[PDB]
């Protein structure tokens, strides 16, 4: 037969947190001719907190059960960023700047 | 036969927080001719708080149960991003900027 | 037989919160000439807060059951951004900027 | 037979915190051309805290059963950043700068 | 038969903390001409706390259960990050700078 017994009693839990926060952040990029990102991350993490639990309870005795699990990725993206060609840019994300210039001159 | 019991009694539980913020977060890019961002992430993270809780209860004695649980993710993506030419760009996001200039003259 | 008795008595249970806020955030990004976004995540994540709670109660003695649970994805996607050219441009995102100047001259 | 009996009594359990902060972080990246960022973690970290928690309880005496948990992933990413030719470009992502000039003279 | 019993009483359990902060970050790269970031971190790591738990409760005496746990990881990505040429760049990510000049002349 089997048994599995589980007793609970006058239990206080409390403050039980889990926190994520600018995880995987590109901030503060600048080009000047050009940016090219290619941002693809894989994320299988765990952030967890647990206070009093339990995990699953399983009884099978004398059980002929076949459990799977599975969890399958396969990846094969093909991704270009192409650019021909760039020339006489000006890029300005400061702040406060003066006389800022460029100059092109091509005689032939 | 078999027997799972479970007894609770008398349970104060509180303060259960799971929080996730400002994740994959792409900020502040400027690009003087071009930005190109390819933009894919994949996400199967957690972020679990469990407090005073239990799985799943299985009472299978004796059984020939098969139980499969599959999770199958393919990825053939083909992302193309293609920018000839650029020029004589002036690019000012900043703020309180003076005299900024591109200049290009070309003679054949 | 079998049998699975659960007795839940005098359970106070509060402050049971899930938050998920500001994912995938793409911000303040200027382009000069051109911006190309491909915004493909692919999100199968679990932001969960449990409290005194139970999973799913199976009471399945010598049973031939087949239990299948599939989730499957598939991608062949294809994007494509493309532009031919750009030249002589003028941008300000930016605020009190002064005397912002672009030239070109072309002589054949 | 078999028993597994478990008793808790008076558990007075608390502040159980796990945070994950600012990670993987790419910040303050200036290209006076260019940036080309290929961004791909793959991440299956955990940040776990446990506190009067017990794992999964298996009660299987004489069983045949097989039990698989698998987790397979395949990378076979392709992907490319190709920018032909840069020049003439003047970035100034910096505060308060004057007299910034960049000039290019051609003469055949 | 087998016996499995664990008993608890008038446990007081507190500040379990679990922290991940900064982890993989670059910051403050700036590149004259190009910056050529390849971020692919895989990242298995466990920053973990335990206090008063205990682990999985196994109880089949005298089984012929097979238990796999896989976890398996293929990486065979192609990343190429190509630049033709860069020339007559100037870039000034610094503040407060006066009088930067960058000049190129050619005669044939």
Chains 1, 2, 3, 4, 5 share one sequence.
Do not use: A, M
């Not at 093909?78 to 020339?87: A, F, M, N, P, T």
């Amino acid at each position: 037969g089997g048994k599995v017994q589980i007793i609970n009693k006058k239990l206080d839990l409390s403050n039980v947190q889990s926190k994520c926060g600018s995880k995987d952040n590109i901030k503060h990029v600048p080009g000047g001719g050009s940016v090219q990102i290619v941002y693809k991350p894989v994320d299988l993490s765990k952030v967890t907190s647990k206070c009093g639990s339990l995990g699953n309870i399983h009884h099978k005795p004398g059980g002929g059960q076949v459990e799977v699990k599975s969890e399958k990725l396969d990846f094969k993206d093909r991704v270009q960023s192409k650019i021909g060609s760039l020339d006489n840019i000006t890029h300005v994300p400061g702040g406060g700047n003066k006389k800022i210039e460029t100059h092109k001159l091509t005689f032939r």
